[PDB]
């Protein structure tokens, strides 16, 4: 394997797992074995739980400034490398150089250094009740959570979930996505590195099945953070709750309406549906995947999205110039392919792309061309389900009450988007579609002061922004009696 | 029967069930039938959330303080009504009218009262991200939601779950216990009296294996507010994830710890200790039902304890002068006798009650005599388990971190509470309790500014004050992006 | 006299001032006296100051809910006599009763009402240091405070000043203008049938020659709040914090700027203009009194602004039919001619008005023409200083930074509008423009939950929304310190 | 002269005053003429001040987070340096270096460290008011503000002011004491090799009556911050207003109260009076100068205290060993000694000090001795007024409610404090006592967490904490109109 094999991350160090097992990562541009990767067993989660417990009370027992400062330097740490972490990250999802270098770690560590600020702006209340009496509630660590990643952002989302997690003072056990174990791990040599005490980042690898459900399970556990599929997040809820009642966040996955308006401009607008639907190779949860397109608009837009799809460099995500990787996996190539032959199938038109790209050694990789189907019905498969690959389904729309409507009409809530340049419509349109994460104008910007997650069934709770940081505490009400106390027996 | 029978509220009136079938509520002083009380159908369900989907469209409509208004209308007429409906409670709950008629409704008002007035004070925020480009996030409300409801304070508990729901802009649907469904068909009545729109207080009664959980699958019930046991929550909140993902709030049993350190004046200790485990007959979740004290204080302790004990009023509960009544039903005596000779049998030492007083017209009627065991060990299921009845375990200590250490092994984590004169150790000791509700020198005041919940197995979330009406909202975040847009593609 | 000799409100009744002076106070519609007024004394001041201190104990000792239903009770019955309250101050302002009825009292009450729904809102925070120690804050009253208001709108302001002051739990000593004294004395009966204890609501009559100048003065006032011209601000701010070290809130003066945008509906923009102009015939601070139009379409806007003007109901403001009213007094209009004089004299184009209205019974009142004019410079002295009559300056530009920069080219920065339909215009704009009131498309609406206030020399902290209440207390932080504690000798 | 000529810092370098004019700053331990230093003239303010106006400008153009990485970036310089500064500080004020190296820069960057990290945490507010409608506020910055030194902690209070001002992204003119100017120019160095833009940070040295007062008059200037003496401020604040009604905060003088209740332990009790007294050789303005003990505690109170006073360890300022220093001057050490005089004249009984210490090197600085007074009474010059200096005078009372009248008996109120075991004597206490500053069982600490400033003539406005950030900036509201516009015309 390129890289030696990988261990589980308990206590400040690597120790060895105890299931006598391991699995392979998988690059997936040239289907070449990166590492064999150790599987935790039901006991090592039990090593990582004790650990975490220790280190919590650590963690917990330092001042609010000693925890921040010890999460800047964190950030310092991130900083330095970001570069050599983007290219660990390049092989481990095949994402373009040019993305992981510029997106990945800044945008992971953006939102630590933000939490790292405010670990002392964390306050209860006081409440008078009377002159003998009065409240105050004090916002505690949860203790130890948990958090499961997925693997399209696998750093990322490994620093947006222990970042306010470890900012509220709580101890996280991570497991990252089988399919992206390397930079979790590094992560947690660069918590240790900077200062976090040994317990409060441990890092378990292996499957969702085994490892995440023994963390779903565990009575000790006080909060599971997930992310990935809506069907898998269903199940992953169900065990938190029935188990022993832990809080939960969920972000999970979309089918996200991007509606352009006949006043838009239809170049801003095909800029915005292509970055909606191609960055990451359309392995992003928050993509606009139902693009709506006025009729009087359809030809002219489709010509403006074609143009730009043509001008797609894929190739080599090791390739300074590649802006289009492939994607993460070939389970999911193979999973993307059968949708867009789902499309074929369903009469839709197809306007690029539309099979795997072959040539040369794009023949070792798990690569799938930029595709685009255009007069689709809401009834096609390709319309209602999420592929999570590079696939745009225009569709085209007579007045905007229609399409705002038909925008609302599935169970995934996850983002939405208008483009216009009129005051009304903009905030009209936005505040009647139904998704918590809403974009006026532009597609993808993810800034760490937005709480963002989905409604309906496309996530429970939010991540980022100062809301996020109070949910990773529990509240606990003081009522101090000074005066007399009376009973009635 | 005493009362006609008793129908759906659906829309502003009184429906039909459509279900063939009906259940008795019966006086537990006494075993009367109450009323013939319909079964909600599965249809029925989905009958209630059209309703509550159309009727939520009007109450959203609405301003903020047109809502304010109407709320503010519903807080009269239960001022009015609270003697009338006090009188109605204690019929159907046996708890005595001392206590119906100056806490239930009082409270469960309090509660609606506190969030009547912030109506308007719910607010997003704002945060500039660069000269071109800024978010607000909108709190909108969730839509349609449920509560389930526990049989111990049944109007209170109806009150205080429909109160932040219908402040935040929702509609939702209540299951009142099977056991008390009276009083809240009556809140059902006043709401729409007061100007709540049609469908924005539906009730529905019937079993929670049946009713309740076609409330907790629905597709289009955004959130679940439970209140009742910690098994049950467990199953409750397994089927609201698994169903569609819902947020959930509940509240659920304890064990809760009352340490009386050295310090404690000894008669407010035991005017504390038992207000913590004989108002409302011992049925109450945040009870302080393990009792510890100092070895050198046991002696002392018990014989306050006993002297209180011997002079409360077991009686009538349509007797004023009661003070202690019959509990909730047959079934439910049964289950506290048997925690009773459980504690006889593990050898627990009885200092008074301990059977159930059939004496004159109690024969009629579910009387358990007040009980208090003492010599207690912390493995006595006794102990251990969740009576939820007239049962008071004493437990000696030796130490103070002994003490704390007790009091927090539990899974439990509802309540909590020390007696003490000393500034320090009463903090000190708070602080290192893990339970969400923490009273210091008193017991049993739940303010409507103060948060409460459990820590651990005895909650997810929390009701009253501010937090809890942020937490009827969801959050969209809306991301305006003023100048120009970049694509990488 | 219409009315019977006015005597000062102290201690909830109706006391003989001790000044054995009066003031007049005069319909302007008309010259009749409505009434003689005493002035307070000195002495008088002193002992106003006494009763609101005995007062304000009784208020801050009960509970927060207690004082939300007195403010309540006290919205309510403002709500039964709008009308009648609406008249008197009619004739003491001579604004149309169309305004009266609909605006005065209406809009005073919904910010009472607004903050007698806060009272249980208001709390401190809780800060943990370590382990051994932690803070909390109390928001405590300030104490006693004193309101000066305004002529323009004397029972609204009453209203704005007291509400917040009420609410945050202390004592308020109003004065009303000389001008208009006659509401503030209805509303200080209202409080008092309401609940509010008395001395907590005091009103002393007199102008800022004396009694106004000995409220500002006195040691024993914590706060100043107060509604006029920036020139009077100065002074009385001067007065507050030399005297005793007092907070002070200042709603003073403006010269606010209206931007049209040459993609602004003329119709709408000309709509805004005239409402920004001569609603209260002009006697409203945050009016948009200098209107920029781009030079392309000067010529189609006076147009539609003077087709407007022309049909303006000037007439009695007895009569429901009217819609622009006399000036509040007969010295105001002298000032207003003078501005007007000014105008013509400095070579500004007349488009309408300009001139005192004679004709019949309007002679014997103090009626001004609604008076626009055209062509104007930003040297003029009618576009540099506030007139606070109805006169719209209507100024030509020709490049947008150039609005703005002008726009913001004053001391004034109390409010400042756009008109435009371009999303991304309107907000960048208005993040520009140096005003503490901004409105987009539309002017004048003050809602409850807005904060308003001004900039530059425009003000001094704010009115309404949430932040407000705030400012009506003092914050007091305690450290509790459990642990050891160290010197250093 | 120890060091070279001071000159002005402005626009990120030194420059040269234009007035002609220097004064000298000495060293209180030994006479030295530690330099000469610049007055700046009428015309060097306006200088500052454009500079001050451009430099805004750039600052405001960054991102929160690159703010904060800045002030971070000058924090880590501080820490470096601040021994070096410390030496510095103890040269300019006097005070021992075992305090310098310990308190008065660690403190200082403490806040700044705090601040820093919440420059991303500002933010307005979001307000729906229809379908049609809704507000949101921006924070903008102020723009220029002033801060004015006090001579105790030069450097700290350089800090405390500028941290919050710079974080709310403004820039500020600061002006050192005439007494201290060494401190406040080295920091404006370190702002610009932080990053800090030219401008942002300047420092005028010079006298108040005149540089202090151009900095308040200037109409430029937004907002001016104080710290002094009472005396002093109230001007300070009548020219801050008169001139331009700029917002304001004073932290002034103080008579703070030190109640020892009778059940507290006399070592913590005179530790904490020590503490209170003598640190910094008694010139802190939150210093317990009046210390009420209970008569039954008196003797063996004055023991402990003399006690402890003898072996306070009075010395040259440069040796680790000293924790007594010199006074700041030897018109400050007149002053003091005058008091002390008084204080002897009145017949207060001395129990030590009460004197200049002049033996050997000590007769070459401004060396006051630890100086008891006890038998005190309320009218006593020395109770009445602040000295600020090592005099504590100690109060005999009776009981609690005597001690808490007498304590508020007095037009200060900054700090307070009380000492006592019990529970609800501490809180009931502290609640009584009119102060903005109270310690339970401590005194002095004042984390950055914690809003600190005086109630009554003892302050307006805060420093640190949450609320300090959110009045560095002034509230902005946006009504954004969707819908149809209303005109009664
Ligand atoms: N919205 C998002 O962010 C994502 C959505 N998806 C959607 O999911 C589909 C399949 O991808 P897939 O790889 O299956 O992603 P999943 O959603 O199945 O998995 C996400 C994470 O959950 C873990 N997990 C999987 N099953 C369980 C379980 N029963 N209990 C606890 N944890 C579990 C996984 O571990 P492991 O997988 O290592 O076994 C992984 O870490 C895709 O088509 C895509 O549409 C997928 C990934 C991310
Ligand atoms: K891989
Ligand atoms: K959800
Ligand atoms: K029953
Ligand atoms: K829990
Ligand atoms: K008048
Ligand atoms: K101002
Ligand atoms: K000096
Ligand atoms: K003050």
Not at 365 to 371: D, S
Request: charged letters at 25%; glycine letters at 10%.
């Amino acid at each position: 394997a390129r890289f030696e094999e990988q261990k589980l991350y308990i206590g400040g160090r690597y120790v060895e797992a105890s299931s006598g097992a391991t699995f392979e990562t998988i690059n997936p541009a040239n289907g070449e074995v990166l590492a064999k990767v150790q599987r935790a067993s039901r006991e090592d989660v039990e090593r990582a739980v004790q650990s975490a417990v220790e280190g919590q009370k650590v963690w917990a027992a330092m001042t609010a400034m000693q925890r921040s400062r010890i999460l800047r330097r964190a950030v310092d740490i991130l900083r330095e490398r970001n570069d050599e972490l983007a290219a660990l990250e390049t092989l481990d999802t095949g994402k373009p150089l040019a993305e992981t270098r510029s997106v990945d770690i800044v945008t992971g560590a953006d939102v630590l250094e933000y939490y790292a600020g405010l670990v002392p702006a964390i306050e209860g209340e006081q409440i008078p009740l009377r002159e003998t009496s009065f409240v105050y509630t004090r916002r505690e660590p949860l203790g130890v959570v948990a958090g499961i990643g997925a693997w399209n952002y696998p750093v990322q989302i490994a620093l947006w979930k222990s970042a306010p997690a470890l900012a509220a003072g709580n101890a996280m056990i991570f497991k990252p996505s089988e399919v992206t174990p390397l930079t979790a791990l590094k992560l947690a040599e660069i918590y240790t590195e900077a200062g976090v005490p040994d317990g409060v980042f441990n890092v378990l690898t292996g499957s969702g099945r085994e490892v995440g459900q023994w963390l779903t399970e565990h009575p000790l556990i006080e909060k599971i953070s997930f992310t990935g599929g809506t069907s898998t997040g269903k199940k992953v809820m169900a065990s938190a709750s029935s188990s022993s009642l832990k809080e939960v966040t969920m972000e999970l996955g979309g089918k996200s309406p991007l509606i352009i308006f006949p006043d838009a401009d239809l170049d801003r607008a095909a800029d915005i549906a292509v970055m909606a639907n191609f960055f990451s190779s359309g392995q992003v949860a928050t993509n606009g995947t139902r693009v709506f397109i006025h009729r009087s608009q359809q030809a002219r837009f489709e010509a403006k999205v074609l143009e730009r799809v043509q001008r797609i460099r894929l190739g080599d995500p090791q390739d300074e110039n590649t802006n289009f990787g492939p994607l993460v996996s070939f389970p999911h190539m193979e999973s993307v392919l059968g949708y867009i032959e789902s499309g074929k199938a369903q009469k839709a038109r197809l306007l690029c792309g539309g099979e795997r790209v072959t040539d040369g050694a794009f023949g070792k990789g798990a690569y799938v061309a930029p595709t685009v189907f255009t007069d689709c019905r809401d009834d096609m498969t390709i319309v209602r389900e999420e592929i999570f690959g590079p696939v745009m389904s225009i569709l085209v729309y007579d007045d905007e009450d229609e399409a705002i409507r038909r925008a609302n009409d599935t169970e995934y809530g996850l983002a939405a988007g208008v483009v216009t340049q009129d005051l009304a419509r903009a905030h009209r349109a936005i505040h009647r579609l139904e998704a918590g994460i809403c974009w006026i104008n532009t597609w993808g910007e993810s800034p760490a002061e937005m709480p963002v997650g989905g409604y309906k069934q496309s996530g429970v709770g939010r991540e980022n922004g100062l809301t996020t940081l109070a949910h990773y505490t529990r509240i606990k009400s003081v009522q101090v009696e000074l005066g007399d106390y009376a009973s009635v027996f």
